[PDB]
Ligand binder design. Structure first.
Ligand SMILES: O=C(O)Cc1c(-c2ccccc2)c2cc(Cl)ccc2[nH]c1=O
Ligand SMILES: O=C(O)Cc1c(-c2ccccc2)c2cc(Cl)ccc2[nH]c1=O
Ligand SMILES: [Ca+2]
Ligand SMILES: [Ca+2]
Ligand SMILES: [Cl-]
Ligand SMILES: [Cl-]
Lengths: 144, 144
């Protein structure tokens, strides 16, 4: 998709741990972190954090049951976030992010550190704007 | 100050808990969260997260000893962050953010939720651009 308010939110597993990945669809910009466990509390918290930082209008996921908890629904309600239905189920940021995580894995002891390093590398890499430059360009243009 | 790479990073205390607050100096845009405890590990982790999301060149703090830990220094080294020395010690986002936190405190059980709600309110409030609009404007203009 390409609307500037659309985000994709999924969890991946690595080293018996859970990584929450949010992708700004229009830009490829990512935010991610290791979460203690795959729960509605964690997801709702991540969403509130995301919505305070970017203009999040709609969120899609590849696992719809991710968004059934009362806590998630309350976070989306409070922040004014809707579920995206204009993206069908049939990218692979998860493999690409895991590729980068594997590249920097030894640069840190804890996976959570490695994940942030990978996010940094992903968002700054030019290919020629970076995802980080693209998101601010897309959002700033959408204001004016 | 007004350079687009300058951030201010402090901790506040509330309800026997610790809130890490990062302020984009040029825009007034904030990121914050409740951290388990006031440690170098927590600060370094916050900094890596921040640097992967925004172009962080320099960081100032009101408590210089915040940045003495080996872990913090390594995070700044890795991300290419320098300590800001162009801002002297003699804003009050901490009182203003605590004001908003107190306004929404009952809207959530856990302080960490309240804090994100306050960040959201702060960043979206027009006064007439919002801090959230100002930061993307400042950063996007600084690319082109
Ligand atoms: O390895 C981790 O997961 C973070 C970490 C780092 C570190 C911080 C930034 C980049 C890479 C590693 C660290 C670094 C030093 Cl010089 C000493 C203790 C340290 N202790 C830690 O826990
Ligand atoms: O109160 C918290 O700190 C978060 C939270 C919320 C909540 C989520 C977003 C905004 C406000 C509160 C919640 C909401 C419902 Cl409808 C049910 C269980 C819930 N349980 C929780 O832990
Ligand atoms: Ca319930
Ligand atoms: Ca040491
Ligand atoms: Cl280490
Ligand atoms: Cl509650």
């Amino acid at each position: 998709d390409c609307s500037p308010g659309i985000w994709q939110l999924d969890c991946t597993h690595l080293e018996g741990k859970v990584i929450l990945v949010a992708v700004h669809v229009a830009s490829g910009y990512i935010e991610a972190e290791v979460i203690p466990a795959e729960t509605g509390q964690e997801t709702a918290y991540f969403l509130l954090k995301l919505a305070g930082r970017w203009p999040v209008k709609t969120v899609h996921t590849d696992n719809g049951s991710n968004f059934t908890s009362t806590t998630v629904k309350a976070a989306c309600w409070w922040a004014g976030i809707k579920q995206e239905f204009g993206i069908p189920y049939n990218e692979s940021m998860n493999k690409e992010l895991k590729k980068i995580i594997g590249q920097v894995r030894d640069q840190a002891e804890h996976l959570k550190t490695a994940v942030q390093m990978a996010v940094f590398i992903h968002n700054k890499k030019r290919k020629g704007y970076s995802a980080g430059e693209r998101i601010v360009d897309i959002i700033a243009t959408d204001i004016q």
